[PDB]
Ligand binder design. Structure first.
Ligand SMILES: [Cl-]
Ligand SMILES: [Cl-]
Lengths: 137, 135, 136, 135
């Protein structure tokens, strides 16, 4: 899953933050350091959490949000992208059972096969579940 | 069982609906998408309907006698036949299995234990999928 | 995958054919029968073609070709769908090797990650293969 | 290595290109789409170029100096950084494994006996792979 970052030049190096996550500043000197430095900052503030068993936040969907942000249009900020694998931060898998009506299951399966933004039922219902609970809106 | 569908060409593919089912339009691009997206609109609408305790539509007697239907020549349509399996739309309960991370499943539990106009996992994820698959 | 069939009301019930498949006629008495009578007509009609190691043709793609087909507005045909698993018919799965430049393989991965109508390399490259040889 | 991209708000989504790679533009709908679609346009363009033995592009010097580009403010855009690994785009061969049915496979093989602008399976499959993604 891909999270947004703003990157600013600074005199020796660059400093940046996750606009959608307070208390996540980062820095470094060559631009080749950005994503590495960033995820590490991300992971540090977050280890507070899911040693408590908390979930990764849902990543944003709307691009206009960021293309209209004044910090990018006028104050010289630069958009960047940190890619994260949830399997790495989230623990072991859990397999479990549900019951619902056939016609609903059918409806869901037919929805996934036409949308194709979804590889299976677990991914689909997991995606729907992480945003109701913890969205970055 | 057979429900007929009307299929109209559309600049970027096709356009369609069910003559027997009010409010059940579909569309797509490829040939494959005709049956697949029509059955999708059907499954969805027929989930809306029985979520809310409405009566389900039946298939018509002589589906083929839609050939002579006016709204079919008047526009430039053809007739289609989708075969739907009645077993797949029964409201019989059915058990299935999902995999996801511990963290997510714990949060779903805490959310449900707290915000409960939700008794358990199944109806939470069910209410959730209903809102999404809708249009 | 999904082949097109044309379907005609008769006095006895119905009859039809795969309009993209020469001489593959089928019929039956109720409409309940349509999907299985057509697939069995199918299964035999092309049985010759794969002792001879031919592949199933590719499901067409343009829906306009079909919507405007004379046989469907004019003579009163009814369009229908047969869904055909390629697993059976063609001999079993066989695993092999390829080489190509890392570049291109990278580009392929990303076209698949970005259009996700394909699933994986095997499905993506199989579909391209099938369509160069068959088309119509 | 970092390539700067100009990103433009479009009615439902975004629009964009790489100021250091002529002819490499991209578009999409969601935010994930941004870096994804951009690296994909890059991978495809980079393949077309070296396919036809053109000079490959190189990441510019100070990519941050682009925030002051007339091509950006005169059109309402923003600047983003895509990071790209050099290794993924080397020209050297790599081998891998594919799984498909015998009839298909041998259908290909005697399609590697006739039109021989197609010499072996890998070349054949790459030609069609190329044809497809150049679009
Ligand atoms: Cl970045
Ligand atoms: Cl059918």
């Amino acid at each position: 899953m891909i999270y947004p970052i703003f990157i600013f030049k600074t005199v020796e190096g660059f400093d940046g933050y996750f606009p959608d996550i307070d208390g996540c500043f980062f820095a470094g000197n060559t631009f080749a350091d950005i994503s590495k430095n960033a995820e590490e900052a991300f992971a540090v503030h977050i280890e507070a959490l899911m040693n408590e068993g908390f979930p990764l936040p849902s990543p944003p969907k709307d691009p206009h949000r960021y293309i209209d942000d004044p910090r990018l249009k006028e104050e010289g900020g630069i958009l960047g992208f940190v890619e994260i694998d949830p399997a790495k931060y989230e623990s072991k898998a859990v397999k479990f059972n549900l019951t619902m009506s056939q016609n609903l299951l059918t409806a869901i399966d037919k929805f996934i096969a036409t949308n194709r933004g979804y590889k299976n039922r677990s991914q689909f219902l997991a995606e729907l579940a992480r945003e109701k609970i913890i969205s970055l809106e």
